[PDB]
Design a protein around this ligand. Sequence first.
Ligand SMILES: C[C@@H]1[C@H](C(=O)N2CCCC2)CCCN1S(C)(=O)=O
Ligand SMILES: [Cl-]
Ligand SMILES: [Zn+2]
Length: 571
Amino acid sequence: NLDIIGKRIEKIKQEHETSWHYDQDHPYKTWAYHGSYETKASSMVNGVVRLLTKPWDIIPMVTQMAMTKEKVDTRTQEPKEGTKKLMKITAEWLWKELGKKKTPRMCTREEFTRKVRSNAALGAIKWKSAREAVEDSGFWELVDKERNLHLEGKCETCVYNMMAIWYMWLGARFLEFEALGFLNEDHWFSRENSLSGVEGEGLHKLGYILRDVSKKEGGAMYADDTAGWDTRITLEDLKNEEMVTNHMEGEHKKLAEAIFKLTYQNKVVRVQRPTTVMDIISRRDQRGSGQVVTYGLNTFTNMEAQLIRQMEGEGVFKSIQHLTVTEEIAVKNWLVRVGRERLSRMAISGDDCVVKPLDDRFASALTALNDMGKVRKDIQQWEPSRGWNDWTQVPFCSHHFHELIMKDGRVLVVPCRNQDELIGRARISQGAGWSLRETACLGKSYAQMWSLMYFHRRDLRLAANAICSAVPSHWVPTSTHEWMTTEDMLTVWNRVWIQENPWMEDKTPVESWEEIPYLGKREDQWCGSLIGLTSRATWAKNIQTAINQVRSLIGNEEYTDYMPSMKRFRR
Ligand SMILES: C[C@@H]1[C@H](C(=O)N2CCCC2)CCCN1S(C)(=O)=O
Ligand SMILES: [Cl-]
Ligand SMILES: [Zn+2]
């Protein structure tokens, strides 16, 4: 407790000896409050994308996206003994399986520096930017001090800042990356290694993966969301995740144990409270880690929970209250006998899952799932899950997936979501100080993503071609990301959908964009197309005038006309 968090608490109080007010009106119940001290990033519109998507200026679902808790202060109960036993047995077996073909290892200062020098979200807070602290040895001396302290089993500076997303100073992030970065850097949650995972799988992969799950004999496909997954991570979950250290050795094992003990299973956080003080609060459970370590540990614990729910549906155990000695044997024998087969019936991306169980008993197998605290979103606690009968209607990673047959008979499985969401996101830039050139290169990144993933949506292929025509041809797209390149998008399309696509036997390249199909016109409208509206017809017909408006603003640069890549503009 205070023996582990005290030092961190003391150091902050000292730097705020003046203003250390123990407010007696603190709003925290489930967080432990310690003290306070005196202190003092909205959406911005991308003008390049907006000028080239004029019909959407009058669609509230698009325009409202650019305008403008009671979950974090909740307390999850302690799982029953039978549940705790199911979780420990499953977790032990799952780390063994994930470790069979992987070797845990420390990630290096050298690896961390490259990442920072390639700009990535390390959710970090003397040095202005991380790119600077990484080139100054003084920061690394600070890392050494905390590191040696971690080897002592104590912590000084690994403190969270709330905003939910939990930022730390770069030094704490390095220590987390050095101990646990291997999970992501060496692809422990790849589909090949984990069977349920999809780490490294682009949107041109996910629909084919759902279709492969659909081919298994079984019941409906279930895709139940958890209500605030991060807030429902129990201290028992944090202890099963820590068992990854059992696969480690020497220094690494010690360093990993310290991240789990001192930063995850005990947390210190600073929150901005307008009534404007900074509150120093602590607690033991819930998810607060780097977003990338959070992804892999979410995937792990979700894989564990869904195998246990599958066990409950198959009747492997009778009640969560208490597991008999023989029921433990049975659970272990199920895992050994069919565990890998049951993992292959799932697609799991952090807190997001799709499960095709052995049959529909799974729908009403709710006791372990509720008792683990993984309570389903938008459904009564004991109401049976509603499954999907068609893999093309299953939601996963904010998408659904269409089966699309090319004029030459080959099959594309394409990602899709409501088009208002796609256009609304492309119209938003994050942060400030953007030049016109940098705003244009972000618009081009969205346009090239649309050409690669959403080519089958009439409005996005036309808008992508218009943006790529309006932005200098050689300007590089800014902020898998196969669209982040200056290479010709037809060549990238061929590499992604044909050459490298393991579900495509015939490798005959496509010679033009007109060989590449669209959804049916009615399906396109169902998924939010404006095709058939007067606003959209005038936009399409007059598109060269919009392209010329943006070219005039950017100035006298080298531009390519991509519009004739489409039949209607091809004379
Ligand atoms: C690439 C991710 C995800 C992944 O590999 N991540 C590792 C840590 C951050 C997320 C895998 C599923 C697919 N998506 S998605 C739908 O493109 O966002
Ligand atoms: Cl359905
Ligand atoms: Zn669709």
